[PDB]
Amino acid sequence: STCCGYRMCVPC
Numbered sequence: 001s002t003c004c005g006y007r008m009c010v011p012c
Contacts, residue, residue: 003012
């Protein structure tokens with residue numbers, strides 16, 4: 001479950 005915001009995709 002990876003959430004991409006702007007410049008980075010974080011693990012959620």
